[model samples]
Target chain A: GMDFIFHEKQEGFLCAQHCLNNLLQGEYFSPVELASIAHQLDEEERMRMAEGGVTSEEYLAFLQQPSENMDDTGFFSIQVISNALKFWGLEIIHFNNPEYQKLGIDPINERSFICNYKQHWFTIRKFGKHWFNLNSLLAGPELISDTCLANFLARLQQQAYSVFVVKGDLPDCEADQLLQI
Target chain B: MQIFVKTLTGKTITLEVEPSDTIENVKAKIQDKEGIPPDQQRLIFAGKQLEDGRTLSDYNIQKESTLHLVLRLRGX
Candidate 1:
């Protein structure tokens, strides 16, 4: 039997929490924590909008619109996810970015990835030597074979999913350590 | 253990199963009762897709847990 894999079951619309915790391999974030980040982002965007003049028509229009960073359904935007990952020193690069392509970065060589479609977010991360689809919409972490990883990402891309390459040292986990042995 | 399988149409199907039962096992049972082929069935529980080889216990499926069944479209 495996030593342990920290898998959080989906609860309501907290896929962002599940995605972050699963990628980090722990219950490191909560809805409240991520929501706070979203709020900060919303405030920053509001500040930027107000830079044009607080009483301006554009600024008032921006205020009238709902938050782009979060919704009442507990959904958090990619900006929020990016800010949260920064807490652990991880940065995400857009898979289709020109710099990413010009550098000839192989996604498989990356430590982890975060993908999104519609409002749902998920992570595809490497544990030990194998890649797993840590999508919260599954029964458990899916063991994605190395050979199929590229094709899998391609298919998701074709479906209009936003793919981001997570770059940095990921926190250590029992699954990686035990499986490495 | 007894678990519930909810379809996209919002219909629920109850099944009598054991914790050791693999996803394939439950799919076969769904096929027997509802005439849905296992190949076209995609089962999800607690937001994760249930792989055929993994058991209910592997996914921490408990009594009365609800699994969602989405139809797998061809030519993806």
Candidate 2:
């Protein structure tokens, strides 16, 4: 199932669904909620929250009582985090680690990974068997609005576009609609 | 009229949902079982907000209305 993510400002629905997730967060949730991801390369550091028994147990809540009046800048900085987290999450889960937090990377390292994950330019690259590492690599300001995640997604997408083509088979026009922020 | 209440915290009790029973009332029933206040309580249903005034009937709450309740996570 090819799922598409768009921010509220952009055009379509957030692939990560950040606006919904953030608005309906039930009591005792962390802003940094990662979904559909496995642990990263490192196992030991990945499970600290689990081992120490995270002060909070993060869970997703829904209001199916849908609200048409949703959010704007709401979707802005979020995509960067979700897209990046989504791809990395897939990798970690594919590898069966604890959490991506164990990867031992700072903001700078995040930007670097977005561009060249083994000289493949990220978007069209595959890591472990089914590990399609696109979300994290594609993350940038358009997604999250924040500096680290935004720059990362934007740069990676810019780089990937040169080598790849979207539905239009053109550089800017094809996926230009996908970048919501 | 007596209604049966269910909680994810493993508590079951019978309470009356009077016509005047507001969301605050249902939450009061929940607080009786979970020992938490309404404002401090964040009830989730499959990843969404369960408003305080919204009744179980509003969401088609049926027999054995089970709710997932947790403390509202707060910080500066």
Candidate 3:
């Protein structure tokens, strides 16, 4: 029998928060917390631009640009997602990275993945022995079979979705434990 | 009446169910067609989760109504 699954529904432009919480399998993040990270990233980028000198044309132009980390509509950049995952000691690796290639990691065999297409973000994670798509846009987690996992990811890639592999120990959850049995 | 069950993968499974059928019964039908266990199925209609003990009429389900089927967390 199945126990519980934590799934958050999509609300407004908060897909990043939903995506992060879904990936973590709980309500571990909030819009405010993610916004804070976005702000920090914005500050870091500003400082880096300031290296060109505060009065320089490039610096002034950078200042005129809206933040790349976040927007007023609650949209967050990938850097915010990466930073939030780092807090859990999780690393997001580019699916096509040369280092990832050297490891010959198969996407279907991995524990989890986070994907982005345009402004939308989503997660595909394994709970117990099965893979589920935790896309917030959906009504709930979609069970993905092992046979279709490769094709699924390939389809996303063909659609220009940026896929990242999640690496590191995931927090223990009831689904993982129960399904293992 | 017959209804449609939509999966996240864009595949639709059609089921002919009575309006008096319990949500659990509907899940059993889905399991038969999709090979997913009933306990691992979560059916949603009109943004509301359908309770296992509730009948299709309880949620006002009708012919050709589309229900979203999600995977439920499972354990041994």
Candidate 4:
């Protein structure tokens, strides 16, 4: 049997924290602890902005890209998330299009997913042979029904986006390999 | 024939396709290779959306051409 954990964003800046907690499968990280991690990520992003001459908008778009509201959208990066979940065998597979094999994993297998629906980030978990959306604490895990899921995909399709998949555990040396990026 | 699929992230997936192949065929292939359900794939070539019913030649999708792929997302 599998049970999906529930968590709400503590504040406007903590969606990433909530997602990490869900993915990490524990409440070990407090808002402050996760915020520190966010700050470090911000600094790294700022440096990358310098290295790549990433304009303010570009940095926000390419690195910590958000949608809709800047103030409300939580700040985090795939790279940072990649590092955070490395030990858990999290292999971050990214696709910018709406077609493919199972992100290289069997659907029934347990894995943690952090999805970006525009600027907002939420955690999706594979539990009980189905994927549940952990987007808000306001409601429990919503079964990602195909019809509803199709509607959501069409909405994103009107623009252009992709889902990033995180799965599998990593060996110690492999964990180090994911950190440099 | 071969065409390049450039994902929004800038990574590319190569497909060996026939000009006579329907866009759906390649989509089926991508579905097998990348795990994206075919219905969820929106393939754009030269600023036009590729229709599954249409053959590559119908869109003038010659070999070596590049098509952009974007995935659909669902949320609140």
Judge candidate 1 at residue A10 and give its lDDT. Answer: 77
Local distance difference test scores for all models: 0.74, 0.32, 0.73, 0.57
| Higher-DockQ candidate of 2 and 4 | 4
Question: What are the interface RMSDs of all the models?
Answer: 19.0, 18.3, 19.5, 9.2
Candidate 1 local lDDT, A1-181, one digit each (tens): 1327767767767888888898999999976898798788777556545555778766676677766567655567666777889899887655654545677766677778887766577889887777888877777877888788877766444554666677899999888887674
lDDT of 2 by residue, A65-102 (tens): 22111223222122122233333221111111113335
- Supply candidate 3's per-residue lDDT for A101: 61
Comparing candidate 2 with candidate 3, which one achieves the higher lDDT?
3
Candidate 1 off by > 4 Å:
A1-3, B1-76
Predicted candidate 3 versus true structure: per-residue lDDT over A1-181, tens digit per residue: 1227778888866887888888888889986898798788777556555645778766676677676568656677656777899889897755654446677766677898887766578889998779998888887888999998877766433444666778899888776887785
Q: Is candidate 1 or candidate 2 better by TM-score?
A: 1
- Give the Å shift of residue A6 in candidate 1: 1.6
TM values, all candidates = 0.67, 0.26, 0.67, 0.45
TM-score of chain A of each: 0.93, 0.18, 0.93, 0.56
Per-residue alpha-carbon lDDT of model 1 for B37-58, expressed as tens digits?
A: 5765767665455789999999
Give the better candidate number (1 or 4) by lDDT.
1
Checking candidate 3 for backbone clashes, the offending pairs are: A178-B75
lDDT minimum window of 10 residues, candidate 3 chain B: B67-76
